[PDB]
Design a protein around this ligand. Structure first.
Ligand SMILES: Nc1ncnc2c1ncn2[C@@H]1O[C@H](COP(=O)(O)OP(=O)(O)NP(=O)(O)O)[C@@H](O)[C@H]1O
Ligand SMILES: [K+]
Ligand SMILES: [K+]
Ligand SMILES: [K+]
Ligand SMILES: [Mg+2]
Ligand SMILES: [Mg+2]
Length: 299
């Protein structure tokens, strides 16, 4: 941090204690966040912010450079061929992908399957020129379970049928049981801590994304607070995905809020499942057929 203009050793101490360790967090911070540090004037606060942006080259970019920012995005396979296709490759890092679906459509399964697939290096697709091996080395997942449906047995089973060691998935997946929107939100904000603690968090799951909010703001009279709170939560999730280049997945029970990718899943005949991609920034709407068996998502 002393590389940053207007940052002495004393200021560095305060900054690291206030949670500002890397340059990006400072570069993307507001003078408010920093001034509230105490002992930090807005003069020095704005100076280090300007500095951090430069050290990270956060200015205008054109020509080929526009292609290079987009190449930092890696994708996670869903184990379903048709799904990965409709996804333009697989689940994207630096974005929030939502799987909305009717009761029992498989929302949770997809979340579990994803934590498992994260441990199979062959399932992470990326441009080895823009994303080094080290950046996706020892990947870990964070699972914020709002429903109480996280099943370690299901992780083991999905893993075994894939050849991956189940226990290895469990060792590299953090699970946080949230009982309300406050915990759900706080757990999300605390993911930054797991990273500064050395954990290469590359997958974040929120199952469910909307359960707590609906249950707490039922009275449609204070639906304003709800949208604001959830929106603040989505902002946190997106920033988290961008800065730490990881894939964020969320589920939503449906029979408005932000989400960069939106799927609606429904049950087909028996094993069959139909996921409809109905919103994304660069892809056409489309359907994907697959199934859920003892092996997880397949076909
Ligand atoms: N071990 C398994 N073997 C085969 N199928 C399984 C297994 N475990 C779960 N399933 C399938 O997964 C379905 C339920 O998946 P689930 O992910 O819980 O749907 P959901 O959308 O999350 N339901 P809900 O959260 O209540 O709205 C079951 O009813 C089973 O068909
Ligand atoms: K300095
Ligand atoms: K079923
Ligand atoms: K969108
Ligand atoms: Mg993004
Ligand atoms: Mg579920």
């Amino acid at each position: 941090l002393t590389d940053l203009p207007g940052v002495g050793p004393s200021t560095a101490e305060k900054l690291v204690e206030a949670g500002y360790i890397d340059f990006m967090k400072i570069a993307t911070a507001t003078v408010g966040e920093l001034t509230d540090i105490e002992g930090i004037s807005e003069k020095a606060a704005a100076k280090m912010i300007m500095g951090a942006r430069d050290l990270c080259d956060l200015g205008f970019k054109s020509g080929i450079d526009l292609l290079k920012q987009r190449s930092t995005v890696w994708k996670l396979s869903t184990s379903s061929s048709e799904l990965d296709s409709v996804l333009g490759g697989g689940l994207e890092s630096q974005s929030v992908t939502e799987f909305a679906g009717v009761f029992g459509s498989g929302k949770t399964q997809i979340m579990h399957q994803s934590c498992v697939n994260l441990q199979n290096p062959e399932f992470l697709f990326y441009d080895e020129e823009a994303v080094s091996k080290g950046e996706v080395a020892q990947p870990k997942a964070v699972y914020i379970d709002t429903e109480g449906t996280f099943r370690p047995e299901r992780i083991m089973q999905m893993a075994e049928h894939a050849g991956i060691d189940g226990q290895t998935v469990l060792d590299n997946t953090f699970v946080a049981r949230a009982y309300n929107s406050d915990m759900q939100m706080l757990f999300a904000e605390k993911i930054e801590d797991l990273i500064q603690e050395g954990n290469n968090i590359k997958l974040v799951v929120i199952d469910s994304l909307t359960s707590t909010f609906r249950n707490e703001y039922t009275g449609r009279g204070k639906l304003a607070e709800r949208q604001q709170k959830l929106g603040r939560h989505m902002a946190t999730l997106n920033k988290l995905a961008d800065l730490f280049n990881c894939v964020v997945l969320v589920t939503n029970q449906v029979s408005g809020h932000a989400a960069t990718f939106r799927f609606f899943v429904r049950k087909g005949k028996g094993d069959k499942r139909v996921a409809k991609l109905y919103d994304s920034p660069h892809l056409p709407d489309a359907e994907a057929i697959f199934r859920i068996t003892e092996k997880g998502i397949q076909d």
